[PDB]
């Protein structure tokens, strides 16, 4: 949600730019400041604690009368900012890229989960110093790779095939920006290797997404991995994928919606996304999300019964 | 599991019999006693605390080196024994019925749940003094009525139709005899009124037993209510309904297996019970419980999709 | 240990005497008083809290610089004093018996255990009002009865025959005068009915006193019940039974040592007590307590092996 | 109980094999995997946390619906695996021994007790680096030595002679695989030096195994040390020594049952083991374990009386 | 310190006056009120909680910015007010005495200690209903009696003669108005019966006031009992007895200073009080309190040595 | 109380002896051992934990059935043993001194207080490495110096003159061997510099030992410092100084009783010690300790009055 500027600021090192985090006490001194409408876009200078983000980012931090910001007063904020800076310092920035590299939108939950991944002494982001850089660059947005299992967000593995991996997103026990709804449950399926999947494996995946998580729809936000989210939410997700697609007339990213395997996606979401990709307006697209239909929406018929009978014995 | 003798003893009151509970300290004094094999079947007399159950009930109480008994040292034991005695004192017993009324098998969990029901100041067993007597007599076994909603065991209502009621059995947080497996989940469906159910109501029940609890099979132990238990258990239940049916060559109860509505019972369990009722041996009956089949096992096709589409909006 | 005067005082009610307890705050005011050696034997009058025991009982209560008294500041002291008074008020005392009824020696632990017995809603001292009077009169010393099971001290039944009963003395968790040694373990065997015991029962008792408690000697202090105490203590007990026997030249009690069944008592203690009863001096008696001997000290040979073989299967 | 493969896996280092432990998070990812019945015997590869034991070891780890595995999620699992690997890395393995060195059966409790021994800064396994290697190799099974006091399992010394040592096994307060029965008590006697014991020392041992632990039988599982276990268990031990002896037709170990000193072993167990060693079937062997007999089963008569008389004074 | 009006208000009952306490919530509503300087002396009427003391008593209750008031929000305030009202309701008041009976000065600590005395089920103020009335009337000031032991303030008896009684004032653990100095220790000696004391008793008192409390001076504030207070305070007491004596030109009480036994009072305080009683000014009186002198200030010489020698043995 | 052998053992290092402490687990293994009466005086060898003190020191350690030993299982035991060894390693011992250097009697409380002194980062035993050696050698007994302030035991300074220093002994909050009596209070006065004290300083000391601690007698055990202990104890101290003096016919120490300044010592103790030094028997010496007398026992008369008058102002 938040931009990259809320976490770090650029400091020109006479060849290229360095990036330095903020202090929570420098932000706290900015929420109380009184600056005029000529200096909202320039970084603030709290004499005692250093530089602070510009004042226009007021309503992005958890003040007294605010709850839609992030808990910047936490030990996790510093870790996430150090992660972002360590990533951006490797990637050399130029004098004409700074304004377009600190203005990108990132998911703070993704970054916090990467932090949690890199501190597990038995992970592989804890040993491999290059995999962590690749993961962080993918999360930031300055990379052209696809999020696979080895650089995925993280969570808790609840199913592992020879080609897929299901993670359970632990967004309730976060600190920097936890989910406030106490009824949140969500999963995601990431591919192990970017390559054509076989047919015996898609069946082992769908025979588990139908028996265990049957109250959950399989959708995708465009990139190369599926998201498992309950039906009573599929509405709000549609109104959130259409915005981003429509908010991409600002050409800084080419909106290349990667419609994944149709034998796995919910047929209604496949229809809606195919329409939205072909260039149809909103209200004619969401019409395809609420339309009842049962024409051939079961590729692999005779799956749940097999699981029942294998469970009995 | 335990008999009725473990909870109370008969005391002849010169017209008919009275029934009096035991003391936990009188039982504790019996587990340590040393009686010879002529007096195992006669009640014990612990000089200080009164009468105690016969010594042959040694391995029915939670000693130091035992865990398949009941926690008689608890405040719930006294409540359950008082309940049993208050029920049996109403029903007048004769000098030739005592040996056949304290030798019946009861479910201690059923009695404990009745106790929990009668102490809820907003129940109806808390006001109506006759409904509690009917419920307790049904639980004991000295009644010819069917367990309906108004005299059911109890638990926590998770679904209520116009004709059915689903209860969630809280067997883990019991005291007298809790379930030791920490993965126990089980439900039961009881009818509201003993009368023919309509067809629009069976559909509202099956449209909920297929969407929410899809990993659970619908079985029945013979009486007039369904039990919802997970598939990985349907084996052990079959080996437990066949014993009781086979252990009814001792004619004190006429084994009248009430096969309930076939549109609700799992078809495999319906076949197995119909066979066992027709008088076939065990191994040819359980053969019908593991046989894979999908010939017309969906009376109401097109139900889960309706629930999906009603959930989306 | 303490006398009966430490718990109650006599108040003349113009026909016979009444007995009234003390106040702990009246005793506390006496430990600080300053009385001259003419009024040590007369009751004290603490103006604010009433009468207090005579000052000569100074070193009988737990002061700051004392630990061989009793915890009179406890709720148990009041209960024990009320028990003693309720017993002595029934037994009518005369103007020439008061000085010889408050000068008797009692075991405070016995009285506290009686108190604990009478408050157990499932005892029989809790119902029968006459059994409690008999028990308390036996404990005080104004009765000519023998302590049987039904009026015994109390504890925790660890074995119950058809003729005997073993109790485990809980002297560590007392309040009025607990045992300070944290390695104290002791039992006592009381007879159920005062009558000749059979022979099949003495064998069931000795087959348990040899298998379970083999590190414990069976002794007796004179009255009609056995005491099971470990060998490393049998010395101090001998020096305590000989004193009481020798301190009975003051004829207020006829020392009638009831040597119990020789097939149960430790042969050394039987010899020592028989000698002391015949009128031999101390050092020639205790000579029989340390003399090694194995001439026919096993009446029932072949007992422990039977228990081993019954335990194996 | 568990094999050596559950703790470590071999990694070929181009001269011989290295051995590396597992990660608990790599095992947790294997219990959820879905592998086909061609790859059950090959190590698993959980992309994120590394290698994991083969899937055929499913029911060897404490899952949700399991309790007969080990608590692999504990800090003790890692210590035990590091111990096993440090032992096996010293002993050079060859390309034709790996399949027969990770398939051996070990006692996890033995290994955990060795771990507890090596971290006591005042032990000798804490200083001597070679004694720890000898102890661990004895525990694993790749050594031809006998477990003496200096390389024993461990516990708490409750008796120490000039030739023997009694340890009290603390199996209830373990973490990797504690005993679940809360009535477990067991001891073991190990020899100090492998050499002929004198006669004045066997008497000091038997005079303590008869006075203190009289409810305990002295048995042996074949190796060079005695085990003190209560009689109500001697049945289950017999059915467990006979299996291992009978399961040694697979010649990888020569079953050399070292019947220890007959003056110490329970005569029934000596007879049973001598029979089973001579090659008699089970039911004729266990016949000698339940047969009552008292022909000359007391070599040193007049021992307990000496202890009584030494305790009195 | 506080007046009697702070605790109760008069309500005319058409024959004489009744007295009713206040509510703490009615006082809290008065501290916030805004009354003009015509109604400071008339009782306040907080519409919701009733009558409240006049506003001129503002700085007599513990507000936020105050600590020299009393903790009126405590359960002790209500008890003390009920005590005062129960006393004043017995004593019939007339239409020309109300203004002079609620304007008296009382010691709140005295009243709180009386409350503590009357709730001790083993006191005598707990039984005798007339002694409590006498005590409370003495404390208030509407009685012509002398505070003896049986109606004394209270505390903890630390010494009791045949004629005196020493109490230890527990002013630190009060609630209504505790002493804030955490180094406060003070005693008082009250006479048992108002009658001439013997000579053997004054010696037993002075032989204890010289050995135990030697750092404490014996003074008196005028009434019939001694106060034991440490020397570093005898200054402030002198400046407090002289005020009250000088503030008695307002003749509502006849200042009759009862100089007690000169063999007990500190000679300097005896001289100072005799002077102040004869009618000398302050600075010439306090001159006699700091003058060093040792002419015959030991009536009973040879006392501490006797106590030493009695302590040795 | 304990000897030096209970803390360390000698190990011959081929030139002179080294000294090494014990392990608590090596002592625990010795209390359970079974050694014959030829090897009681030779060090024990617990195979697992090393050397252990000889078995004749059984009743010197806190077992289960013992309380007159020391808490060897504490972290303080190791510190005290390390202190003793570090002291004895400096002082070179010879092959004919070991038996007479580990047989000396030391006060364990003194050593524990030295340990507490050396770990205070603001002491001087924490900086000066030679003062700690001098202090420890004085405590052990291998030095010919007098305990002055700079090498004193320790405690809490409650008075400091220009020539004396009073310490308050904190023996209740020790760990290795605390005082069990909860009414223990004791002080000691040590000289600052070994040199003749003036006369204006002895007066400042006695004017404080008479005002504050008047219930305490000033005694001395022979060395160069006074001990302040309450009168009710002066008996037991006399029976303890006479033993040591009489137990010095074993000439390993020349009993040189240093009778200190007579103007400070209690005159009775001065008389008793002078007698015992002149060579009179016990019962004629203790006669001088209980004799009442007041002939010129006040050198500085007119001291307490000065303190009163200085306290008033």
PDB file of N, CA and C in Angstrom, chain A residues 158-220:
ATOM      1  N   UNK A 158       1.317 -25.761   3.754  1.00  0.00           N
ATOM      2  CA  UNK A 158       0.227 -26.666   4.088  1.00  0.00           C
ATOM      3  C   UNK A 158       0.018 -27.734   3.038  1.00  0.00           C
ATOM      4  N   UNK A 159       0.763 -27.696   1.941  1.00  0.00           N
ATOM      5  CA  UNK A 159       0.677 -28.700   0.895  1.00  0.00           C
ATOM      6  C   UNK A 159       1.844 -28.481  -0.045  1.00  0.00           C
ATOM      7  N   UNK A 160       2.495 -29.561  -0.450  1.00  0.00           N
ATOM      8  CA  UNK A 160       3.637 -29.462  -1.348  1.00  0.00           C
ATOM      9  C   UNK A 160       3.566 -30.610  -2.336  1.00  0.00           C
ATOM     10  N   UNK A 161       3.389 -30.278  -3.596  1.00  0.00           N
ATOM     11  CA  UNK A 161       3.362 -31.249  -4.674  1.00  0.00           C
ATOM     12  C   UNK A 161       4.764 -31.374  -5.254  1.00  0.00           C
ATOM     13  N   UNK A 162       4.880 -32.018  -6.407  1.00  0.00           N
ATOM     14  CA  UNK A 162       6.131 -31.984  -7.147  1.00  0.00           C
ATOM     15  C   UNK A 162       6.250 -30.754  -8.029  1.00  0.00           C
ATOM     16  N   UNK A 163       5.175 -29.985  -8.185  1.00  0.00           N
ATOM     17  CA  UNK A 163       5.175 -28.812  -9.044  1.00  0.00           C
ATOM     18  C   UNK A 163       4.590 -27.565  -8.408  1.00  0.00           C
ATOM     19  N   UNK A 164       3.842 -27.673  -7.314  1.00  0.00           N
ATOM     20  CA  UNK A 164       3.187 -26.544  -6.671  1.00  0.00           C
ATOM     21  C   UNK A 164       3.584 -26.469  -5.207  1.00  0.00           C
ATOM     22  N   UNK A 165       3.198 -25.373  -4.562  1.00  0.00           N
ATOM     23  CA  UNK A 165       3.369 -25.257  -3.120  1.00  0.00           C
ATOM     24  C   UNK A 165       2.313 -24.315  -2.581  1.00  0.00           C
ATOM     25  N   UNK A 166       1.563 -24.760  -1.577  1.00  0.00           N
ATOM     26  CA  UNK A 166       0.541 -23.944  -0.940  1.00  0.00           C
ATOM     27  C   UNK A 166       1.091 -23.347   0.340  1.00  0.00           C
ATOM     28  N   UNK A 167       0.951 -22.043   0.491  1.00  0.00           N
ATOM     29  CA  UNK A 167       1.338 -21.350   1.703  1.00  0.00           C
ATOM     30  C   UNK A 167       0.105 -20.760   2.353  1.00  0.00           C
ATOM     31  N   UNK A 168       0.116 -20.724   3.678  1.00  0.00           N
ATOM     32  CA  UNK A 168      -0.942 -20.108   4.464  1.00  0.00           C
ATOM     33  C   UNK A 168      -0.443 -18.764   4.976  1.00  0.00           C
ATOM     34  N   UNK A 169      -1.071 -17.688   4.525  1.00  0.00           N
ATOM     35  CA  UNK A 169      -0.606 -16.349   4.848  1.00  0.00           C
ATOM     36  C   UNK A 169      -0.955 -15.993   6.282  1.00  0.00           C
ATOM     37  N   UNK A 170       0.066 -15.720   7.086  1.00  0.00           N
ATOM     38  CA  UNK A 170      -0.117 -15.324   8.478  1.00  0.00           C
ATOM     39  C   UNK A 170      -0.106 -13.800   8.588  1.00  0.00           C
ATOM     40  N   UNK A 171      -1.212 -13.199   8.169  1.00  0.00           N
ATOM     41  CA  UNK A 171      -1.358 -11.754   8.174  1.00  0.00           C
ATOM     42  C   UNK A 171      -1.971 -11.226   9.457  1.00  0.00           C
ATOM     43  N   UNK A 172      -2.455 -12.094  10.334  1.00  0.00           N
ATOM     44  CA  UNK A 172      -3.056 -11.635  11.577  1.00  0.00           C
ATOM     45  C   UNK A 172      -2.028 -11.375  12.661  1.00  0.00           C
ATOM     46  N   UNK A 173      -0.922 -12.112  12.654  1.00  0.00           N
ATOM     47  CA  UNK A 173       0.114 -11.977  13.664  1.00  0.00           C
ATOM     48  C   UNK A 173       1.296 -11.150  13.175  1.00  0.00           C
ATOM     49  N   UNK A 174       1.053 -10.216  12.267  1.00  0.00           N
ATOM     50  CA  UNK A 174       2.065  -9.268  11.845  1.00  0.00           C
ATOM     51  C   UNK A 174       2.158  -8.127  12.851  1.00  0.00           C
ATOM     52  N   UNK A 175       3.160  -7.279  12.674  1.00  0.00           N
ATOM     53  CA  UNK A 175       3.325  -6.112  13.530  1.00  0.00           C
ATOM     54  C   UNK A 175       3.304  -4.802  12.768  1.00  0.00           C
ATOM     55  N   UNK A 176       3.925  -4.750  11.596  1.00  0.00           N
ATOM     56  CA  UNK A 176       4.020  -3.491  10.873  1.00  0.00           C
ATOM     57  C   UNK A 176       2.671  -3.068  10.318  1.00  0.00           C
ATOM     58  N   UNK A 177       1.866  -4.019   9.884  1.00  0.00           N
ATOM     59  CA  UNK A 177       0.560  -3.701   9.330  1.00  0.00           C
ATOM     60  C   UNK A 177      -0.322  -4.939   9.326  1.00  0.00           C
ATOM     61  N   UNK A 178      -0.742  -5.432  10.486  1.00  0.00           N
ATOM     62  CA  UNK A 178      -1.539  -6.656  10.515  1.00  0.00           C
ATOM     63  C   UNK A 178      -2.945  -6.412  10.002  1.00  0.00           C
ATOM     64  N   UNK A 179      -3.603  -7.504   9.643  1.00  0.00           N
ATOM     65  CA  UNK A 179      -5.000  -7.475   9.239  1.00  0.00           C
ATOM     66  C   UNK A 179      -5.848  -7.319  10.489  1.00  0.00           C
ATOM     67  N   UNK A 180      -6.789  -6.376  10.452  1.00  0.00           N
ATOM     68  CA  UNK A 180      -7.584  -6.091  11.637  1.00  0.00           C
ATOM     69  C   UNK A 180      -8.802  -6.996  11.744  1.00  0.00           C
ATOM     70  N   UNK A 181      -9.285  -7.527  10.625  1.00  0.00           N
ATOM     71  CA  UNK A 181     -10.399  -8.463  10.660  1.00  0.00           C
ATOM     72  C   UNK A 181      -9.943  -9.789  11.253  1.00  0.00           C
ATOM     73  N   UNK A 182     -10.580 -10.200  12.342  1.00  0.00           N
ATOM     74  CA  UNK A 182     -10.192 -11.413  13.048  1.00  0.00           C
ATOM     75  C   UNK A 182     -10.765 -12.675  12.421  1.00  0.00           C
ATOM     76  N   UNK A 183     -11.324 -12.576  11.217  1.00  0.00           N
ATOM     77  CA  UNK A 183     -11.840 -13.723  10.480  1.00  0.00           C
ATOM     78  C   UNK A 183     -11.124 -13.897   9.148  1.00  0.00           C
ATOM     79  N   UNK A 184      -9.854 -13.520   9.092  1.00  0.00           N
ATOM     80  CA  UNK A 184      -9.097 -13.539   7.853  1.00  0.00           C
ATOM     81  C   UNK A 184      -8.402 -14.880   7.681  1.00  0.00           C
ATOM     82  N   UNK A 185      -8.649 -15.532   6.551  1.00  0.00           N
ATOM     83  CA  UNK A 185      -7.932 -16.744   6.173  1.00  0.00           C
ATOM     84  C   UNK A 185      -7.703 -16.697   4.673  1.00  0.00           C
ATOM     85  N   UNK A 186      -6.477 -16.975   4.248  1.00  0.00           N
ATOM     86  CA  UNK A 186      -6.137 -16.836   2.844  1.00  0.00           C
ATOM     87  C   UNK A 186      -4.898 -17.663   2.562  1.00  0.00           C
ATOM     88  N   UNK A 187      -4.836 -18.247   1.369  1.00  0.00           N
ATOM     89  CA  UNK A 187      -3.704 -19.070   0.975  1.00  0.00           C
ATOM     90  C   UNK A 187      -3.184 -18.601  -0.369  1.00  0.00           C
ATOM     91  N   UNK A 188      -2.017 -19.097  -0.754  1.00  0.00           N
ATOM     92  CA  UNK A 188      -1.538 -18.839  -2.103  1.00  0.00           C
ATOM     93  C   UNK A 188      -0.743 -20.024  -2.609  1.00  0.00           C
ATOM     94  N   UNK A 189      -0.858 -20.282  -3.901  1.00  0.00           N
ATOM     95  CA  UNK A 189      -0.196 -21.400  -4.553  1.00  0.00           C
ATOM     96  C   UNK A 189       0.848 -20.831  -5.488  1.00  0.00           C
ATOM     97  N   UNK A 190       2.103 -21.205  -5.273  1.00  0.00           N
ATOM     98  CA  UNK A 190       3.199 -20.763  -6.119  1.00  0.00           C
ATOM     99  C   UNK A 190       3.839 -21.954  -6.810  1.00  0.00           C
ATOM    100  N   UNK A 191       4.295 -21.730  -8.037  1.00  0.00           N
ATOM    101  CA  UNK A 191       4.931 -22.779  -8.815  1.00  0.00           C
ATOM    102  C   UNK A 191       6.373 -22.980  -8.370  1.00  0.00           C
ATOM    103  N   UNK A 192       6.807 -24.235  -8.381  1.00  0.00           N
ATOM    104  CA  UNK A 192       8.170 -24.547  -7.979  1.00  0.00           C
ATOM    105  C   UNK A 192       9.187 -24.135  -9.028  1.00  0.00           C
ATOM    106  N   UNK A 193       8.947 -24.477 -10.287  1.00  0.00           N
ATOM    107  CA  UNK A 193       9.858 -24.109 -11.363  1.00  0.00           C
ATOM    108  C   UNK A 193       9.035 -23.548 -12.508  1.00  0.00           C
ATOM    109  N   UNK A 194       9.500 -22.451 -13.098  1.00  0.00           N
ATOM    110  CA  UNK A 194       8.793 -21.860 -14.226  1.00  0.00           C
ATOM    111  C   UNK A 194       8.957 -22.734 -15.462  1.00  0.00           C
ATOM    112  N   UNK A 195       8.000 -23.624 -15.687  1.00  0.00           N
ATOM    113  CA  UNK A 195       8.045 -24.583 -16.782  1.00  0.00           C
ATOM    114  C   UNK A 195       6.660 -25.208 -16.916  1.00  0.00           C
ATOM    115  N   UNK A 196       6.351 -25.795 -18.072  1.00  0.00           N
ATOM    116  CA  UNK A 196       5.031 -26.413 -18.254  1.00  0.00           C
ATOM    117  C   UNK A 196       4.773 -27.511 -17.234  1.00  0.00           C
ATOM    118  N   UNK A 197       3.628 -27.421 -16.572  1.00  0.00           N
ATOM    119  CA  UNK A 197       3.238 -28.403 -15.575  1.00  0.00           C
ATOM    120  C   UNK A 197       2.639 -29.608 -16.284  1.00  0.00           C
ATOM    121  N   UNK A 198       2.803 -30.778 -15.684  1.00  0.00           N
ATOM    122  CA  UNK A 198       2.287 -32.000 -16.271  1.00  0.00           C
ATOM    123  C   UNK A 198       0.784 -32.062 -16.030  1.00  0.00           C
ATOM    124  N   UNK A 199       0.180 -33.215 -16.287  1.00  0.00           N
ATOM    125  CA  UNK A 199      -1.248 -33.381 -16.073  1.00  0.00           C
ATOM    126  C   UNK A 199      -1.566 -34.206 -14.842  1.00  0.00           C
ATOM    127  N   UNK A 200      -0.673 -35.111 -14.445  1.00  0.00           N
ATOM    128  CA  UNK A 200      -0.897 -35.866 -13.226  1.00  0.00           C
ATOM    129  C   UNK A 200      -0.736 -34.984 -11.998  1.00  0.00           C
ATOM    130  N   UNK A 201      -0.049 -33.845 -12.117  1.00  0.00           N
ATOM    131  CA  UNK A 201       0.156 -32.953 -10.982  1.00  0.00           C
ATOM    132  C   UNK A 201      -0.978 -31.957 -10.792  1.00  0.00           C
ATOM    133  N   UNK A 202      -1.527 -31.423 -11.879  1.00  0.00           N
ATOM    134  CA  UNK A 202      -2.676 -30.542 -11.749  1.00  0.00           C
ATOM    135  C   UNK A 202      -3.829 -31.281 -11.093  1.00  0.00           C
ATOM    136  N   UNK A 203      -3.937 -32.583 -11.346  1.00  0.00           N
ATOM    137  CA  UNK A 203      -4.990 -33.362 -10.715  1.00  0.00           C
ATOM    138  C   UNK A 203      -4.754 -33.520  -9.223  1.00  0.00           C
ATOM    139  N   UNK A 204      -3.513 -33.757  -8.798  1.00  0.00           N
ATOM    140  CA  UNK A 204      -3.243 -33.830  -7.366  1.00  0.00           C
ATOM    141  C   UNK A 204      -3.468 -32.492  -6.681  1.00  0.00           C
ATOM    142  N   UNK A 205      -3.320 -31.382  -7.405  1.00  0.00           N
ATOM    143  CA  UNK A 205      -3.611 -30.092  -6.788  1.00  0.00           C
ATOM    144  C   UNK A 205      -5.111 -29.858  -6.676  1.00  0.00           C
ATOM    145  N   UNK A 206      -5.857 -30.153  -7.740  1.00  0.00           N
ATOM    146  CA  UNK A 206      -7.287 -29.862  -7.732  1.00  0.00           C
ATOM    147  C   UNK A 206      -8.034 -30.851  -6.842  1.00  0.00           C
ATOM    148  N   UNK A 207      -7.485 -32.049  -6.655  1.00  0.00           N
ATOM    149  CA  UNK A 207      -8.101 -32.994  -5.735  1.00  0.00           C
ATOM    150  C   UNK A 207      -7.886 -32.612  -4.284  1.00  0.00           C
ATOM    151  N   UNK A 208      -7.036 -31.630  -4.012  1.00  0.00           N
ATOM    152  CA  UNK A 208      -6.865 -31.092  -2.675  1.00  0.00           C
ATOM    153  C   UNK A 208      -7.551 -29.756  -2.490  1.00  0.00           C
ATOM    154  N   UNK A 209      -7.649 -28.956  -3.541  1.00  0.00           N
ATOM    155  CA  UNK A 209      -8.390 -27.708  -3.459  1.00  0.00           C
ATOM    156  C   UNK A 209      -9.897 -27.912  -3.478  1.00  0.00           C
ATOM    157  N   UNK A 210     -10.375 -29.132  -3.705  1.00  0.00           N
ATOM    158  CA  UNK A 210     -11.799 -29.428  -3.707  1.00  0.00           C
ATOM    159  C   UNK A 210     -12.253 -30.151  -2.458  1.00  0.00           C
ATOM    160  N   UNK A 211     -11.372 -30.901  -1.813  1.00  0.00           N
ATOM    161  CA  UNK A 211     -11.713 -31.644  -0.615  1.00  0.00           C
ATOM    162  C   UNK A 211     -11.497 -30.831   0.646  1.00  0.00           C
ATOM    163  N   UNK A 212     -10.311 -30.260   0.814  1.00  0.00           N
ATOM    164  CA  UNK A 212     -10.024 -29.524   2.034  1.00  0.00           C
ATOM    165  C   UNK A 212     -10.624 -28.127   1.992  1.00  0.00           C
ATOM    166  N   UNK A 213     -10.197 -27.310   1.034  1.00  0.00           N
ATOM    167  CA  UNK A 213     -10.652 -25.926   0.929  1.00  0.00           C
ATOM    168  C   UNK A 213     -11.727 -25.834  -0.146  1.00  0.00           C
ATOM    169  N   UNK A 214     -12.934 -26.285   0.181  1.00  0.00           N
ATOM    170  CA  UNK A 214     -14.010 -26.195  -0.796  1.00  0.00           C
ATOM    171  C   UNK A 214     -14.780 -24.893  -0.716  1.00  0.00           C
ATOM    172  N   UNK A 215     -14.675 -24.172   0.392  1.00  0.00           N
ATOM    173  CA  UNK A 215     -15.329 -22.887   0.554  1.00  0.00           C
ATOM    174  C   UNK A 215     -14.476 -21.737   0.055  1.00  0.00           C
ATOM    175  N   UNK A 216     -13.457 -22.025  -0.747  1.00  0.00           N
ATOM    176  CA  UNK A 216     -12.482 -21.040  -1.188  1.00  0.00           C
ATOM    177  C   UNK A 216     -12.404 -21.050  -2.703  1.00  0.00           C
ATOM    178  N   UNK A 217     -12.405 -19.870  -3.303  1.00  0.00           N
ATOM    179  CA  UNK A 217     -12.256 -19.698  -4.735  1.00  0.00           C
ATOM    180  C   UNK A 217     -10.803 -19.435  -5.089  1.00  0.00           C
ATOM    181  N   UNK A 218     -10.421 -19.884  -6.278  1.00  0.00           N
ATOM    182  CA  UNK A 218      -9.060 -19.770  -6.781  1.00  0.00           C
ATOM    183  C   UNK A 218      -9.031 -18.622  -7.780  1.00  0.00           C
ATOM    184  N   UNK A 219      -8.338 -17.541  -7.442  1.00  0.00           N
ATOM    185  CA  UNK A 219      -8.277 -16.375  -8.311  1.00  0.00           C
ATOM    186  C   UNK A 219      -6.822 -16.038  -8.587  1.00  0.00           C
ATOM    187  N   UNK A 220      -6.583 -14.961  -9.324  1.00  0.00           N
ATOM    188  CA  UNK A 220      -5.230 -14.499  -9.588  1.00  0.00           C
ATOM    189  C   UNK A 220      -5.259 -13.010  -9.869  1.00  0.00           C
TER     190      UNK A 220
END
